[PDB]
Paper text:
The carboxypeptidase TAFIa (activated thrombin activatable fibrinolysis inhibitor) is a central player in fibrinolysis.
In addition, we obtained crystal structures of the complexes of anabaenopeptin B (1), anabaenopeptin C (2) and anabaenopeptin F (3) with the surrogate protease carboxypeptidase B (CPB). The general binding modes of 1–3 were found to be very similar and in the following discussion the complex with 2 is used as an example. The linear part of the anabaenopeptins, which mimics the carboxy-terminus of the TAFIa substrate fibrin, deeply penetrated the active site channel and bound in the carboxylate- and specificity-pockets, while the circular parts of the anabaenopeptins were positioned in the entrance of the channel and completely blocked the channel like a plug, thereby preventing other molecules from entering it. Calculations with PISA33 revealed that the total surface area of 2 was 1036 Å3, while the area of the 2–CBP interface was 519 Å3. Thus, about 50% of the surface of 2 got buried upon binding, contributing to the high affinity. In line with the very high binding affinity of 2, there were no unsatisfied buried hydrogen bonds. All hydrogen bond donor and acceptor atoms of 2 interacted either with hydrogen bond donor/acceptors from the protein, or with bound water molecules. Within the cyclic core of 2, the side chain of the D-lysine residue (R2) had van der Waals interactions with the side chains of Tyr198 and Phe279. The amide moiety bridging R2-D-lysine and R3-valine interacted with the side chains of Arg71, Arg127 and Tyr248.
Residue numbers in the entry:
A (entry chain A): 6 to 188, 188A, 189 to 308
B (entry chain F): 2 to 6
The structure:
Amino acid sequence: GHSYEKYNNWETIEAWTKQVTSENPDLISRTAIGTTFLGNNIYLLKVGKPGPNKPAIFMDCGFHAREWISHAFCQWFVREAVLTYGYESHMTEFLNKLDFYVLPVLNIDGYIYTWTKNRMWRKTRSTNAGTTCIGTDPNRNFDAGWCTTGASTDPCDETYCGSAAESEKETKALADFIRNNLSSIKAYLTIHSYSQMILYPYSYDYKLPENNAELNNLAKAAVKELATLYGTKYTYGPGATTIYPAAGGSDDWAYDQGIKYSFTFELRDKGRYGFILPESQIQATCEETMLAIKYVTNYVLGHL
Amino acid sequence: XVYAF
Ligand SMILES: [Zn+2]
Protein backbone atom coordinates (compact mmCIF):
# COMPACT_ATOMS: atom_id res chain seq x y z
CA GLY A 1 0.00 0.00 0.00
CA HIS A 2 0.87 3.69 -0.01
CA SER A 3 3.05 5.29 2.65
CA TYR A 4 4.20 8.90 2.91
CA GLU A 5 7.19 7.55 4.80
CA LYS A 6 8.31 5.28 1.96
CA TYR A 7 9.07 5.62 -1.74
CA ASN A 8 6.04 4.45 -3.72
CA ASN A 9 6.04 3.06 -7.26
CA TRP A 10 3.98 4.60 -10.03
CA GLU A 11 1.07 2.17 -9.69
CA THR A 12 0.79 3.15 -6.04
CA ILE A 13 1.11 6.88 -6.67
CA GLU A 14 -1.49 6.78 -9.42
CA ALA A 15 -3.96 4.98 -7.15
CA TRP A 16 -3.03 7.47 -4.45
CA THR A 17 -3.93 10.45 -6.66
CA LYS A 18 -7.43 9.00 -7.03
CA GLN A 19 -7.82 7.97 -3.38
CA VAL A 20 -6.66 11.22 -1.75
CA THR A 21 -8.88 13.19 -4.13
CA SER A 22 -11.78 10.86 -3.33
CA GLU A 23 -11.18 11.16 0.42
CA ASN A 24 -10.97 14.97 0.27
CA PRO A 25 -13.37 16.16 -2.49
CA ASP A 26 -13.70 19.43 -0.58
CA LEU A 27 -9.98 20.24 -0.88
CA ILE A 28 -8.77 18.40 -3.97
CA SER A 29 -9.74 17.85 -7.60
CA ARG A 30 -7.76 15.85 -10.15
CA THR A 31 -7.17 16.11 -13.89
CA ALA A 32 -4.50 15.02 -16.33
CA ILE A 33 -2.59 17.68 -18.29
CA GLY A 34 -1.34 15.24 -20.90
CA THR A 35 0.04 11.75 -21.46
CA THR A 36 3.62 10.49 -21.54
CA PHE A 37 5.55 8.88 -24.38
CA LEU A 38 4.36 5.52 -23.04
CA GLY A 39 0.80 6.67 -22.51
CA ASN A 40 0.80 7.23 -18.77
CA ASN A 41 -1.44 10.00 -17.44
CA ILE A 42 0.33 13.08 -16.14
CA TYR A 43 -1.92 13.77 -13.15
CA LEU A 44 -2.34 17.22 -11.69
CA LEU A 45 -3.92 17.79 -8.28
CA LYS A 46 -5.60 21.10 -7.61
CA VAL A 47 -5.39 21.68 -3.88
CA GLY A 48 -7.47 24.39 -2.27
CA LYS A 49 -10.89 25.36 -1.02
CA PRO A 50 -12.64 26.04 -4.33
CA GLY A 51 -13.61 29.61 -5.12
CA PRO A 52 -14.09 32.04 -8.04
CA ASN A 53 -10.98 33.49 -9.65
CA LYS A 54 -8.32 32.33 -7.20
CA PRO A 55 -4.60 32.88 -7.79
CA ALA A 56 -2.47 29.74 -7.93
CA ILE A 57 0.90 28.39 -7.03
CA PHE A 58 2.25 25.66 -9.29
CA MET A 59 4.55 22.92 -8.02
CA ASP A 60 5.91 19.88 -9.83
CA CYS A 61 8.08 16.99 -8.69
CA GLY A 62 9.79 14.12 -10.47
CA PHE A 63 11.30 15.87 -13.49
CA HIS A 64 14.23 13.50 -13.04
CA ALA A 65 13.36 9.86 -12.59
CA ARG A 66 16.07 8.96 -10.07
CA GLU A 67 15.42 11.84 -7.65
CA TRP A 68 12.90 9.86 -5.59
CA ILE A 69 12.77 12.28 -2.63
CA SER A 70 11.27 14.72 -5.14
CA HIS A 71 8.26 12.53 -5.85
CA ALA A 72 7.95 11.81 -2.15
CA PHE A 73 7.68 15.49 -1.25
CA CYS A 74 4.76 16.33 -3.55
CA GLN A 75 2.91 13.45 -1.90
CA TRP A 76 3.91 14.77 1.52
CA PHE A 77 2.81 18.31 0.72
CA VAL A 78 -0.67 17.14 -0.28
CA ARG A 79 -1.11 15.05 2.86
CA GLU A 80 -0.02 18.03 4.96
CA ALA A 81 -2.47 20.31 3.16
CA VAL A 82 -5.42 18.04 3.86
CA LEU A 83 -4.26 17.18 7.39
CA THR A 84 -3.60 20.69 8.67
CA TYR A 85 -6.33 22.60 6.84
CA GLY A 86 -8.65 23.97 9.50
CA TYR A 87 -6.16 23.09 12.22
CA GLU A 88 -3.10 25.18 11.36
CA SER A 89 -3.82 28.80 10.54
CA HIS A 90 -1.32 29.50 7.75
CA MET A 91 -2.24 26.45 5.68
CA THR A 92 -5.92 27.23 6.24
CA GLU A 93 -5.38 30.79 5.00
CA PHE A 94 -3.35 29.39 2.08
CA LEU A 95 -5.92 26.94 0.83
CA ASN A 96 -8.66 29.47 1.42
CA LYS A 97 -7.03 32.25 -0.59
CA LEU A 98 -5.28 30.32 -3.35
CA ASP A 99 -4.88 27.00 -5.10
CA PHE A 100 -1.86 24.76 -5.26
CA TYR A 101 -1.46 22.94 -8.54
CA VAL A 102 0.57 19.91 -7.53
CA LEU A 103 1.98 17.72 -10.29
CA PRO A 104 3.29 14.72 -8.32
CA VAL A 105 5.30 13.07 -11.11
CA LEU A 106 6.08 14.72 -14.44
CA ASN A 107 8.45 12.11 -15.85
CA ILE A 108 6.40 8.99 -15.14
CA ASP A 109 8.00 6.79 -17.81
CA GLY A 110 11.47 7.43 -16.46
CA TYR A 111 10.30 6.90 -12.89
CA ILE A 112 8.83 3.50 -13.70
CA TYR A 113 12.20 2.68 -15.28
CA THR A 114 14.16 3.45 -12.10
CA TRP A 115 11.91 0.89 -10.38
CA THR A 116 12.07 -1.77 -13.12
CA LYS A 117 15.50 -1.58 -14.74
CA ASN A 118 17.86 1.23 -13.80
CA ARG A 119 17.76 3.12 -10.52
CA MET A 120 20.05 5.82 -11.94
CA TRP A 121 17.89 6.68 -14.95
CA ARG A 122 17.34 10.44 -15.28
CA LYS A 123 15.71 11.20 -18.61
CA THR A 124 12.38 10.46 -20.29
CA ARG A 125 12.02 7.17 -22.20
CA SER A 126 11.28 8.49 -25.68
CA THR A 127 13.04 7.11 -28.74
CA ASN A 128 15.46 9.12 -30.87
CA ALA A 129 16.02 9.13 -34.62
CA GLY A 130 19.34 7.70 -35.77
CA THR A 131 20.32 6.03 -32.49
CA THR A 132 19.23 3.39 -29.98
CA CYS A 133 19.94 5.80 -27.13
CA ILE A 134 16.82 6.67 -25.17
CA GLY A 135 15.36 9.73 -23.59
CA THR A 136 15.58 13.49 -23.30
CA ASP A 137 16.45 15.53 -20.20
CA PRO A 138 13.09 17.20 -19.61
CA ASN A 139 14.91 20.05 -17.87
CA ARG A 140 16.88 20.77 -21.02
CA ASN A 141 13.78 20.57 -23.21
CA PHE A 142 12.09 23.89 -22.41
CA ASP A 143 12.13 26.88 -24.74
CA ALA A 144 14.60 29.01 -22.80
CA GLY A 145 17.98 29.52 -24.42
CA TRP A 146 17.21 26.02 -25.63
CA CYS A 147 20.26 23.75 -26.10
CA THR A 148 22.71 26.68 -26.00
CA THR A 149 24.61 25.83 -22.81
CA GLY A 150 24.83 23.13 -20.13
CA ALA A 151 23.12 20.63 -22.43
CA SER A 152 24.10 18.04 -25.02
CA THR A 153 23.03 17.50 -28.62
CA ASP A 154 23.90 13.83 -28.16
CA PRO A 155 20.85 11.60 -27.36
CA CYS A 156 23.18 9.23 -25.49
CA ASP A 157 23.96 11.90 -22.89
CA GLU A 158 21.85 12.41 -19.76
CA THR A 159 21.55 16.15 -20.44
CA TYR A 160 20.26 15.59 -23.98
CA CYS A 161 18.18 18.59 -24.92
CA GLY A 162 15.78 16.81 -27.27
CA SER A 163 15.19 17.18 -31.00
CA ALA A 164 13.53 20.56 -30.32
CA ALA A 165 12.10 22.57 -27.41
CA GLU A 166 8.97 20.86 -26.10
CA SER A 167 9.78 17.85 -28.29
CA GLU A 168 8.74 15.74 -25.29
CA LYS A 169 5.04 15.16 -24.62
CA GLU A 170 5.59 15.68 -20.90
CA THR A 171 7.30 19.06 -21.26
CA LYS A 172 4.90 20.18 -23.98
CA ALA A 173 2.04 19.21 -21.68
CA LEU A 174 3.52 21.17 -18.80
CA ALA A 175 4.27 24.18 -20.98
CA ASP A 176 0.80 24.05 -22.50
CA PHE A 177 -0.85 23.96 -19.10
CA ILE A 178 1.09 26.93 -17.76
CA ARG A 179 0.32 29.09 -20.80
CA ASN A 180 -3.36 28.12 -20.59
CA ASN A 181 -3.41 29.25 -16.94
CA LEU A 182 -0.82 32.00 -17.03
CA SER A 183 -3.07 34.69 -15.58
CA SER A 184 -3.71 32.76 -12.37
CA ILE A 185 -0.36 31.04 -11.79
CA LYS A 186 1.66 33.41 -9.62
CA ALA A 187 4.53 31.14 -8.67
CA TYR A 188 6.32 28.19 -10.24
CA LEU A 189 8.18 25.76 -8.00
CA THR A 190 9.98 22.68 -9.32
CA ILE A 191 11.33 20.07 -6.91
CA HIS A 192 14.59 18.21 -7.57
CA SER A 193 17.46 16.58 -5.70
CA TYR A 194 20.08 16.75 -4.58
CA SER A 195 22.35 19.60 -3.36
CA GLN A 196 20.31 21.53 -0.80
CA MET A 197 19.74 24.66 -2.87
CA ILE A 198 17.10 27.17 -3.77
CA LEU A 199 17.86 28.46 -7.24
CA TYR A 200 16.19 31.04 -9.46
CA PRO A 201 16.85 32.38 -13.00
CA TYR A 202 18.86 32.45 -14.94
CA SER A 203 20.39 29.11 -15.86
CA TYR A 204 20.58 29.48 -19.64
CA ASP A 205 22.66 32.65 -19.33
CA TYR A 206 24.70 34.65 -16.80
CA LYS A 207 22.21 37.51 -17.05
CA LEU A 208 20.10 38.36 -14.00
CA PRO A 209 16.31 38.77 -13.76
CA GLU A 210 15.02 42.32 -13.26
CA ASN A 211 13.65 41.37 -9.84
CA ASN A 212 16.97 39.73 -9.01
CA ALA A 213 17.16 41.47 -5.64
CA GLU A 214 13.62 40.36 -4.81
CA LEU A 215 14.21 36.71 -5.72
CA ASN A 216 17.50 36.54 -3.83
CA ASN A 217 16.02 37.94 -0.62
CA LEU A 218 13.05 35.56 -0.83
CA ALA A 219 15.20 32.47 -1.36
CA LYS A 220 17.44 33.71 1.44
CA ALA A 221 14.52 34.08 3.81
CA ALA A 222 13.24 30.70 2.65
CA VAL A 223 16.55 28.97 3.30
CA LYS A 224 16.52 30.49 6.79
CA GLU A 225 13.06 29.14 7.61
CA LEU A 226 14.06 25.75 6.25
CA ALA A 227 17.05 25.62 8.62
CA THR A 228 14.98 26.47 11.70
CA LEU A 229 13.88 22.84 12.01
CA TYR A 230 17.08 20.79 11.90
CA GLY A 231 19.81 23.21 10.92
CA THR A 232 19.93 21.81 7.39
CA LYS A 233 21.97 24.31 5.38
CA TYR A 234 20.86 25.43 1.92
CA THR A 235 22.65 27.69 -0.51
CA TYR A 236 20.95 29.94 -3.07
CA GLY A 237 21.28 32.20 -6.09
CA PRO A 238 20.99 32.42 -9.91
CA GLY A 239 21.15 28.94 -11.40
CA ALA A 240 24.00 29.69 -13.79
CA THR A 241 26.53 30.88 -11.20
CA THR A 242 25.17 28.91 -8.25
CA ILE A 243 25.28 25.33 -9.57
CA TYR A 244 26.05 25.43 -13.31
CA PRO A 245 24.80 26.77 -16.69
CA ALA A 246 21.88 24.73 -17.96
CA ALA A 247 19.69 25.97 -20.78
CA GLY A 248 16.18 24.73 -21.44
CA GLY A 249 15.08 24.59 -17.81
CA SER A 250 11.44 24.87 -16.74
CA ASP A 251 12.13 27.48 -14.06
CA ASP A 252 13.75 29.89 -16.54
CA TRP A 253 11.02 29.28 -19.11
CA ALA A 254 8.18 29.89 -16.62
CA TYR A 255 9.83 33.10 -15.48
CA ASP A 256 10.21 34.40 -19.03
CA GLN A 257 6.47 33.77 -19.42
CA GLY A 258 5.91 36.37 -16.73
CA ILE A 259 5.78 34.23 -13.61
CA LYS A 260 7.90 36.48 -11.39
CA TYR A 261 8.49 33.96 -8.61
CA SER A 262 10.30 30.96 -10.04
CA PHE A 263 12.44 28.57 -8.01
CA THR A 264 14.12 25.21 -8.38
CA PHE A 265 14.46 23.34 -5.09
CA GLU A 266 17.27 20.82 -4.77
CA LEU A 267 16.57 18.76 -1.67
CA ARG A 268 18.74 16.48 0.47
CA ASP A 269 21.36 15.60 0.70
CA LYS A 270 24.79 16.95 -0.26
CA GLY A 271 26.23 13.72 -1.61
CA ARG A 272 26.54 11.21 1.23
CA TYR A 273 23.62 9.23 -0.20
CA GLY A 274 22.82 11.44 -3.16
CA PHE A 275 19.89 10.14 -5.20
CA ILE A 276 19.42 7.07 -2.99
CA LEU A 277 18.36 9.03 0.10
CA PRO A 278 17.40 6.50 2.79
CA GLU A 279 13.67 6.30 3.49
CA SER A 280 14.32 7.18 7.14
CA GLN A 281 15.16 10.69 5.98
CA ILE A 282 11.97 11.23 3.98
CA GLN A 283 9.98 12.69 6.88
CA ALA A 284 12.56 15.21 8.09
CA THR A 285 13.41 16.26 4.56
CA CYS A 286 9.77 16.93 3.70
CA GLU A 287 9.07 18.69 7.01
CA GLU A 288 11.83 21.24 6.64
CA THR A 289 10.96 21.65 2.94
CA MET A 290 7.38 22.45 3.94
CA LEU A 291 8.66 25.50 5.84
CA ALA A 292 10.45 26.97 2.83
CA ILE A 293 7.48 26.23 0.59
CA LYS A 294 5.02 27.78 3.05
CA TYR A 295 7.20 30.87 3.46
CA VAL A 296 7.32 31.48 -0.29
CA THR A 297 3.57 30.90 -0.48
CA ASN A 298 2.94 33.48 2.24
CA TYR A 299 5.20 35.94 0.43
CA VAL A 300 3.47 35.43 -2.93
CA LEU A 301 0.15 35.92 -1.17
CA GLY A 302 1.05 39.36 0.15
CA HIS A 303 2.49 40.46 -3.18
CA LEU A 304 -0.39 39.72 -5.56
CA UNK B 1 21.27 16.48 -10.44
CA VAL B 2 23.88 15.91 -13.18
CA TYR B 3 26.61 13.38 -12.35
CA ALA B 4 28.56 14.26 -10.55
CA PHE B 5 27.80 17.84 -9.50
ZN1 LIG C 1 16.87 17.07 -11.02
